[PDB]
Amino acid sequence: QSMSVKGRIYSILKQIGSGSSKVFQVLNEKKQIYAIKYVNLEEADNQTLDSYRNEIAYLNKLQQHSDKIIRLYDYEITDQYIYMVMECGNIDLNSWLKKKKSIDPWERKSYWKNMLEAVHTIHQHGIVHSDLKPANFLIVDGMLKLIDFGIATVNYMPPEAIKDISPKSDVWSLGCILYYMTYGKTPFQQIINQISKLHAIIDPNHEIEFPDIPEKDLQDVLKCCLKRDPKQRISIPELLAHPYVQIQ
Ligand SMILES: CN(C)C(=O)c1ccc(Nc2cc3c(cn2)cc(-c2cnn(C)c2)n3C(=O)OC(C)(C)C)c(Cl)c1
């Protein structure tokens, strides 16, 4: 029905998502829209508690560094609950890609720069996500914004994570997300048996297909991102200077 976060009252309009936490589309006293995430802490161990405090801390610090990280306006933390007041975005990248059959080569490129800016910011603060998927990015006024940092599907899993993990592990993952926006399928979507899928990702003999596309610069980015040897894989600062990201 309604909720209070640091003196301010908010009215629920819809529930966006939901284990111990629930996300809502809310309204303040000035009828301004936000997204409040309520976390129930009643049955949470110290390890869980610290992980939650660590993502809020990072979310707080990184606000000041990039507009490609979701706005955290305010928050209320007690022993029983967490209330996080954030900006409301239109739709997450995953749901957006499920609905949208095709993708505009310009909208894709714009969303790509956004993902690199967001993931580059977290790298600059010693964070490696490791579990990057489209469900982690949000569309906020024609801009992709990173929703979480991995502190609190297997098609996006880097080969090095399975062989046993660095900022290059997030490169593989982003590379898979762009491969999806380019080819409508992730590189190992064709394999259903999850065990066999994990083998294909780490097997260098399993030569990933890259069909001929009109955007030669885009095909190159995907080849550079999806190199099984992390030492051979392209970095984010290099990706940021690629002709695909920088040229019209
Ligand atoms: C399929 N879905 C549920 C949608 O079409 C959809 C997706 C996203 C939407 N907006 C939205 C979702 C949001 C936020 C802000 N706006 C903030 C968050 C959030 C939670 N934790 N952290 C660190 C950020 N958030 C969120 O978690 O969204 C999902 C439930 C979709 C994953 C809205 Cl209003 C609808």
From Swiss-Prot:
Domain Protein kinase per the UniProt entry, residue ranges: 10-245
A GO molecular-function descriptor: protein serine kinase activity
Tissue expr: Present in rapidly proliferating cell lines.
GO biological process per UniProt: chromosome segregation; female meiosis chromosome segregation; meiotic spindle assembly checkpoint signaling; mitotic spindle assembly checkpoint signaling; mitotic spindle organization; positive regulation of cell population proliferation; positive regulation of SMAD protein signal transduction; protein localization to kinetochore
Domain of life from the UniProt record: Eukaryota
Binding residues for ATP: I16, G17, S18, G19, S20, S21, K22, V23, K37
Keyword annotations from UniProtKB, A to Z: Acetylation, ATP-binding, Kinase, Nucleotide-binding, Phosphoprotein, Serine/threonine-protein kinase, Transferase, Tyrosine-protein kinase
Entry keyword Glycoprotein: no
Active site: D131
GO cellular component: cytoplasm; kinetochore; membrane; nucleus; spindle
Protein family per UniProt: Belongs to the protein kinase superfamily. Ser/Thr protein kinase family.
Function recorded in the entry: Involved in mitotic spindle assembly checkpoint signaling, a process that delays anaphase until chromosomes are bioriented on the spindle, and in the repair of incorrect mitotic kinetochore-spindle microtubule attachments. Phosphorylates MAD1L1 to promote the mitotic spindle assembly checkpoint. Phosphorylates CDCA8/Borealin leading to enhanced AURKB activity at the kinetochore. Phosphorylates SKA3 at 'Ser-34' leading to dissociation of the SKA complex from microtubules and destabilization of microtubule-kinetochore attachments. Phosphorylates KNL1, KNTC1 and autophosphorylates.
UniProt subunit comment: Interacts with TPR; the interactions occurs in a microtubule-independent manner. Interacts with MAD1L1 and MAD2L1.
The protein's name in its UniProt record: Dual specificity protein kinase TTK
Lineage, broadest ranks: Eukaryota, Metazoa, Chordata, Craniata, Vertebrata
Gene field: TTK
Coverage span on the entire protein: 519 to 794 of 857
